[PDB]
Design a binder for this molecule. Structure first.
Ligand SMILES: [K+]
Ligand SMILES: [K+]
Ligand SMILES: [K+]
Ligand SMILES: [K+]
Ligand SMILES: [K+]
Ligand SMILES: [K+]
Ligand SMILES: [K+]
Ligand SMILES: [Mg+2]
Ligand SMILES: [Mg+2]
Ligand SMILES: [Mg+2]
Ligand SMILES: [Mg+2]
Ligand SMILES: [Mg+2]
Ligand SMILES: [Mg+2]
Ligand SMILES: [Mg+2]
Ligand SMILES: [Mg+2]
Ligand SMILES: [Mg+2]
Ligand SMILES: [Mg+2]
Ligand SMILES: [Mg+2]
Ligand SMILES: [Mg+2]
Ligand SMILES: [Mg+2]
Ligand SMILES: [Mg+2]
Ligand code: NA
Ligand code: NA
Ligand code: NA
Ligand code: NA
Lengths: 145, 197, 128, 68, 229, 144, 49, 96
RNA sequence: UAAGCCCAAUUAGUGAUUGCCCAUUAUUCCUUUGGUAAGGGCGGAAACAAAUGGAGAAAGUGUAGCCCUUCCGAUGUAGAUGUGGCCUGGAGGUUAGGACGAAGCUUAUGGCGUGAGCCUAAGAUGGACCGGCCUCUAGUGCAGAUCUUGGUUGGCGUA
RNA sequence: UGCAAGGCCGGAAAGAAAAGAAUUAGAGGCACCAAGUGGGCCUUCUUCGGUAAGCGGAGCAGGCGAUGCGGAAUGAACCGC
RNA sequence: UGAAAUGAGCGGAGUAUUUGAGCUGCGCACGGCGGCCGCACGCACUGGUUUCUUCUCCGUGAUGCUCCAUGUUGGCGAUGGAAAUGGGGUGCCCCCACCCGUCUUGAAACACGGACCAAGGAGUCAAACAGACGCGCAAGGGAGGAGAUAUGGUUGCCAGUACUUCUCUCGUACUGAAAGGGAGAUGCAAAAUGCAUCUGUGGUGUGCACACGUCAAAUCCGUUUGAUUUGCCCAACACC
């Protein structure tokens, strides 16, 4: 009954997700593929949405809101995980199955997720190699249950 | 330097946005800005211009006035053709001086509850501007209508009341006071009721 | 991460617009105040006086707000702030707020290193 | 404290800033009040007849359109 | 694959491209023919005038030259200290800036306007080379209230929407010969904004006859304007 | 709100929109309506004619309850009738009864066309209203 | 002063330029000058006679 | 004065036709500082290292009828301490 | 044998018709800003992981202005108006930071903005509070009033 | 059947020819609500009173006020802009 | 630095092409002189001639919405108490450049206030009215005072919020000093309260949109953008 146009008119200038820092308007929205505060990228607001997220290992998850269960927040978003080695064009096609106006940014985001996974592995390896040579008087271990 | 004396006198104040805080008015302005720029119809352009206007410039219209003008148009209209949709960018208010009105389709920004009841009971329909943009995207077979402004009590006060030919109401809280000198021929001159222009 | 290349940054003016005769009085700050005096030489725009700001000094919109590194500064206060700069990392660089402690700055720098997000005021030893 | 009496300096420039506005056209404000009374009274009767004839003509036009 | 509306757009765009190319070729051919005719006309007129002068001279008679129909007027003074009548005349002549130039008809109503603002303007009788140089190098049209430099004949054709004005040679012919569309052609143009005369001026404050600049220089305005254009 | 007033825009102007020559002085034209017959006469005469003088009789101890006499017209009589009663009302049959003094009115005036016939109980009435309502199939019953 | 713009505005400029070159040819110039002087002198003499 | 352009008087250049020959030629003002800073071929030619410095420019146009020339220096104006001092006008870029 | 006065040139009876130097002016180029501004695009176009072309694309008064293209204007006392313009103390929301250092304070301490200002850095400063954004509110901005109060000061190691 | 007036129904319309035979950086009207002004001073010409005055009083129009910039060494207002 | 090279300039072809100058034909203009003579060679035949003078002819949409990203040759920089490039500091040259705030026609003024710094320091609040703009409702709008009960409860939150009104007020009618009166249209008629009917702008001129057309221009052929006739004319405005 209350459309995305009306909701955007309501929430465009005030929103917990709008981060106007300095003079830049970014977005804390978890379902934003961009960080840009635009109606197309406000995924928490649109009836249908899709966002590219990382997963354990090199896997890439696509979180999709189809608009079928928008009134039930526990069922609004469904995650589908593509295993490591997935083509960013395949991820963009999975996104465009819902939002054809998000395919380019979804391809770019999938490529960025793969790059981040590889760079994180490399940085962690280098950090471990450096830390192997230090005394480290204090180590904290969380108890198991 | 270029001699441009009196070049700011040519410029006029044109407003391309609304002072209104209504999100639904903003939605209507968005839709009809799109329609006015992407369609060749002048109806969309006029509606878009009137949506921007202020409340005082969107005067209310009455159901009796709508009925009278639509009857004047319905005569001299072929019986095969349907009656136009009466479109007003403003408010429609009921008239208790007209009890019998025909079945008309009316589009407006707001209907009073009595006006909506009267239009529906006469057999008509109360449309919104999104419905009008849906059924008549270019505004074909529409009667664009406007409300009356000349009878407003603010308008009746404009101008000096003490100059010849002026019948404006003075700003006075007491009606008995301010009636003696300048209003009566006996009490040292009376303001002339007529002046040739 | 390398920033996105742009046209050469041209500043119309590098000198700051300072208040008239602020050097003669320790009271007066150097911040600009418009001279409204009737016989003010700066207001009358004499030849040998200091200039007043106006629209003509505005900088090119293509290269406006860009720091010498080529990035635009976005203030950040925690690790979760680094995730809106993930996709536009060649446009924006994070600036850790001044009052963020060293304990939190360690985590912020560690996360930004893996994310390949530029920090304008991280530790200089990392990222060379 | 002797001051200056009167001058017309700058008055024409002020009048021509928002320039001398042209007169109202002769088809507007053509009121006949104050004119010769007998002709006015005769014209009133003529206009009465003209208004009645206009009403009759509109009625005939409506009837013809209904007929066609 | 491509969506149906995109395919429709593609087909219509291909048809538009081929039609635009055909129109460009047709306008080029029309401009060539018109320019050829105008050049032959100018040459024949010059030769006829020469022969008439020779015939008049060989028998002791005189040939009276036709009074010039077009004048070229440039503003050689600034915008300070101008009386209201001169200001109004210059505004109606569209000389609102120094070194602004216009083409006017040299009839009685305009000659009496020029005589009243003589101290501010230098005018004369333009030549074909002067008119062509002003149109080709300093030619700007008023398209949607904007000063648009003349870069091809399609802009001229679209702006004037006249059969007799489709090319820069059409505009030059109308201006030079004071045709039936002189007012249309000149009013559809922005006033020419010229550079100061290289080599300087003689005297801004005296008439050309007096040793200055502000009078009517006859055909010497071409020498004056060559250094300005 | 103070943040919207002109005092905030004039911080640094040193005159606040009153000029160097004329200045903002305390009372430069008198206090209140002083000088309405001299040095404010043009204003008083062109904007408030009739202000000065006397007119009419004096009504000592005017009680406005005795003079109470609101009016209603014939075309407005449907405001005092319920919708369903006006649905069944017709000339020559049973008609709704309107009590004007209970509805807040004393006189029936009779301008325009009466939309629904009825029986109007009124303290006062106009001759045109009485004639029109009798023509339309209604009636007026005097009340007190 | 630009070939592209001048040829766009005047397709006949390539022929006017060729005419100018032919006129500026020295042999053509001298032959034309002597011929023109001969014709004009002959016509003037025939007119007076 | 406008410090962006400098006036240079060359020996035996006393006509505008003479000054037109030098248009486009390279121009050098040689001075010295107080400390030995970096130069061209600081590593290739260590013999070049000196307190000697040079500011380069080009001849743009003649000035007057008496053989003066206007000179524009690279990026920055020539110092006012160079006024009345020696300038080198080289014969390149050659056009002959 | 003017560097004076009256007249006349522009490299001088050689062969044509611009000697040269100085503007906040003209012409043109670049950038800004504002239009009674003028237009385009805005139904993601197809494709396209990493290791090893890129990004963005907002139906929009005003922003880091939705993007692109085009044109024209831009000085100003008194005065008017505008500003997703700056700044201050509290209030309602929201979102953060702090004893791994809060406010305050210091600065050849840089960066950003035409500016009001904002931000970072450092303190060999401090020692517990406090930032951003949306709205609300007011005892909300100082250079000068023979301004008020406090401190200091040259005269002066003088009379 | 004439006049005068208010209409109605036609007709024609270089929509204004040719004779030097206009031009326009020409959106016309129409409100509303307000502020500063209300000591002015300089010229070119015209002008009055005064022996005159960097004196007093007018007309037309420009300019200072309110405004810099280039030039008359210097100068509110002169020249250029 | 070719990330769409639009070129007389690139890339393909071709050896031509037309356009000037010669020199000429016929008729016509034109010029002597009164139908003849002339004609510098105008105009038409886009006349002929080709004697010399020129090159001419084709070609690439954007399936790129926007922005950024592509040479050469040295010098310097191979991770340093370094090479650059910007910013900052201090001196110095050559140019500019009267002291601020005021009042004033006119201030750098021999006009008045001006040793320094810190803190403080000046369009406020209320009432009446008007106009602009926002919002609610509309021939109606709205209270106020006060009661009720969530709350007859709670340190507090809660002096709030929720609810109610046969009233009151401002409108929907106005005039006259009062006594007093008290506004529809049309038709038919002309009654010192005339009748009849009621789906209706009292009339006229000028006037959005919309409806039939009609022209002109441009079109990717779908149209769109201008004008315009007629109808109804909204809001207005002018005469009745
Ligand atoms: K002053
Ligand atoms: K009358
Ligand atoms: K712009
Ligand atoms: K906006
Ligand atoms: K202070
Ligand atoms: K001046
Ligand atoms: K009420
Ligand atoms: Mg009324
Ligand atoms: Mg700190
Ligand atoms: Mg003069
Ligand atoms: Mg004021
Ligand atoms: Mg005053
Ligand atoms: Mg795609
Ligand atoms: Mg934008
Ligand atoms: Mg300004
Ligand atoms: Mg001011
Ligand atoms: Mg306080
Ligand atoms: Mg005064
Ligand atoms: Mg004084
Ligand atoms: Mg003095
Ligand atoms: Mg009333
Ligand atoms: Na700066
Ligand atoms: Na001050
Ligand atoms: Na002392
Ligand atoms: Na320095």
């Amino acid at each position: 009954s209350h459309s995305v146009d009306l909701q955007w008119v309501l929430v465009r200038q005030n929103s917990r997700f709008l981060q106007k820092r300095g003079g830049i308007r970014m977005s804390n929205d978890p379902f934003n593929n961009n960080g840009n505060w635009t109606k197309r990228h406000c995924g928490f607001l649109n009836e249908k949405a899709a966002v590219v997220k990382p997963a354990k290992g090199g896997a890439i998850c696509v979180t999709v809101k189809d608009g079928s269960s928008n009134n039930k927040p526990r069922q609004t978003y469904k995650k589908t995980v593509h295993a490591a080695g997935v083509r960013a064009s395949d991820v963009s096609r999975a996104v465009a199955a819902v939002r054809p106006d998000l395919a380019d940014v979804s391809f770019r985001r999938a490529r960025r997720m793969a790059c981040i996974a590889s760079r994180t592995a490399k940085v962690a390896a280098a950090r471990k190699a450096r830390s192997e040579k230090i005394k480290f008087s204090r180590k904290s271990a969380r108890a198991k249950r | 330097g270029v001699d441009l004396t009196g070049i700011s006198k040519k410029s006029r104040v044109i407003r391309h946005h609304t002072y209104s805080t209504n999100p639904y008015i903003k939605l209507l302005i968005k839709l009809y800005k799109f329609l006015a720029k992407r369609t060749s119809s002048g109806f969309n352009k006029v509606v878009y211009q009137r949506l921007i206007k202020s409340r005082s410039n969107r005067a209310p219209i009455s159901l009796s006035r709508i009925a009278v003008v639509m009857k004047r148009k319905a005569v001299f209209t072929a019986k095969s053709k349907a009656a136009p949709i009466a479109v007003v960018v403003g408010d429609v208010l009921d008239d208790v001086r007209m009890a019998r009105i025909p079945a008309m389709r009316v589009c407006a920004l707001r209907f009073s509850k009595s006006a909506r009841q009267s239009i529906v009971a006469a057999g008509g329909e109360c449309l919104t501007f999104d419905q009008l943009a849906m059924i008549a995207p270019t505004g074909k077979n529409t009667y664009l209508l406007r409300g009356r402004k000349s009878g407003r009590e603010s308008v009746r006060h404009f101008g000096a009341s003490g100059v010849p030919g002026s019948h404006s109401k003075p700003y006075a809280t007491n009606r008995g006071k301010e009636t003696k000198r300048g209003r009566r021929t006996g009490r040292s001159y009376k303001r002339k009721a007529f002046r040739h222009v | 991460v390398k920033p996105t290349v742009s046209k050469a940054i041209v500043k119309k003016r590098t000198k700051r617009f300072t208040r008239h005769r602020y050097e003669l009085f320790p009271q007066l700050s150097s911040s600009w105040r418009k001279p409204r005096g009737e016989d003010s030489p700066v207001r009358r725009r004499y030849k040998g006086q200091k200039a007043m700001p106006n629209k003509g000094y505005g900088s090119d919109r293509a290269t406006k707000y860009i720091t010498p590194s080529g990035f635009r500064n976005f203030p950040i206060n925690n690790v979760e702030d680094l995730y809106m700069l993930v996709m536009q990392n060649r446009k924006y660089a994070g600036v850790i707020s001044h009052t963020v402690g060293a304990r939190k700055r360690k985590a912020i720098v560690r996360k930004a290193m893996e994310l390949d997000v530029r920090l304008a005021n991280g530790n200089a030893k990392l990222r060379k | 404290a002797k001051s200056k009496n009167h001058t017309n300096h700058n008055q024409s420039s002020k009048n021509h800033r928002n320039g001398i506005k042209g007169p109202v056209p002769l088809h507007l404000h053509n009121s006949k009040r104050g004119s010769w009374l007998p002709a006015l009274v005769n014209a009133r009767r003529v206009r009465k007849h003209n208004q009645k004839a206009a009403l009759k003509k509109r009625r005939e036009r409506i009837a013809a359109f209904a007929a066609k | 694959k491509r969506a149906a509306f995109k395919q429709q757009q593609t087909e219509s765009f291909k048809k538009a491209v081929v039609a635009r190319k055909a129109a460009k070729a047709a306008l080029k051919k029309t401009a060539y023919l018109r320019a050829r005719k105008y050049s032959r006309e100018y040459r024949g007129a010059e030769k006829k005038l020469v022969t008439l002068r020779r015939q008049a001279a060989s028998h002791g008679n005189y040939y009276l030259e036709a009074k010039p129909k077009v004048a070229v007027v440039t503003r050689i003074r600034g915008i300070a200290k101008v009386n209201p009548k001169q200001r109004k005349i210059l505004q109606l002549l569209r000389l609102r800036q120094i070194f602004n130039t216009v083409f006017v008809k040299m009839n009685k109503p305009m000659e009496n306007m020029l005589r009243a603002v003589e101290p501010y303007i230098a005018y004369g009788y333009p030549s074909l080379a002067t008119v062509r140089a002003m149109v080709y190098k300093r030619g700007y049209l008023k398209i949607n209230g904007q000063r648009v430099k003349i870069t091809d004949n399609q802009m001229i054709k679209d702006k004037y929407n006249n059969v007799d004005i489709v090319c820069a040679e059409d505009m030059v012919n109308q201006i030079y010969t004071c045709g039936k569309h002189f007012r249309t052609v000149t009013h559809g143009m922005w006033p020419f904004k010229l550079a100061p005369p290289a080599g300087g001026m003689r005297q801004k404050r005296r008439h050309f006859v007096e040793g200055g600049d502000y009078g009517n220089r006859d055909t010497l305005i071409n020498r004056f304007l060559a250094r300005m254009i | 709100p103070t943040r919207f007033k002109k005092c905030r825009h004039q911080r640094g102007s040193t005159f606040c929109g009153y000029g160097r020559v004329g200045k903002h002085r305390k009372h430069e034209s008198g206090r209140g309506n002083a000088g309405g017959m001299h040095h404010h006469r043009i204003n008083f005469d062109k904007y408030h004619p009739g202000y000065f003088g006397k007119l009419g009789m004096d009504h000592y101890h005017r009680k406005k309850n005795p003079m109470w006499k609101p009016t209603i017209n014939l075309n407005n009589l449907s405001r005092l009738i319920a919708a369903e009663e006006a649905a069944k009302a017709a000339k020559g049959g049973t008609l709704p009864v309107v009590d004007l003094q209970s509805s807040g009115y004393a006189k029936l005036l009779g301008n325009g066309h009466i939309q629904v016939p009825c029986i109007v109980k009124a303290r006062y009435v106009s001759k045109l209203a009485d004639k029109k309502i009798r023509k339309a199939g209604g009636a007026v019953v005097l009340q007190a | 002063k630009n070939r592209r713009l001048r040829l766009r505005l005047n397709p006949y400029v390539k022929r006017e330029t060729a005419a100018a070159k032919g006129m500026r040819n020295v042999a053509n110039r001298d032959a034309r000058r002597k011929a023109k002087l001969a014709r004009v002198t002959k016509a003037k003499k025939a007119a007076t006679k | 004065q406008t410090k962006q352009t400098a006036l240079v008087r060359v020996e035996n250049v006393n006509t505008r036709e003479d000054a037109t020959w030098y248009v486009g030629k390279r121009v050098c003002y040689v001075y010295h500082g107080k400390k030995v800073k970096r130069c061209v071929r600081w590593s290739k030619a260590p013999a070049r290292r000196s307190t000697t410095r040079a500011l380069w420019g080009r001849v743009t146009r003649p000035h007057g009828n008496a053989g003066m020339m206007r000179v524009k220096f690279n990026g920055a104006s020539v110092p006012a301490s160079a006024i009345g001092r020696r300038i080198r006008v080289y014969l390149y870029p050659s056009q002959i």
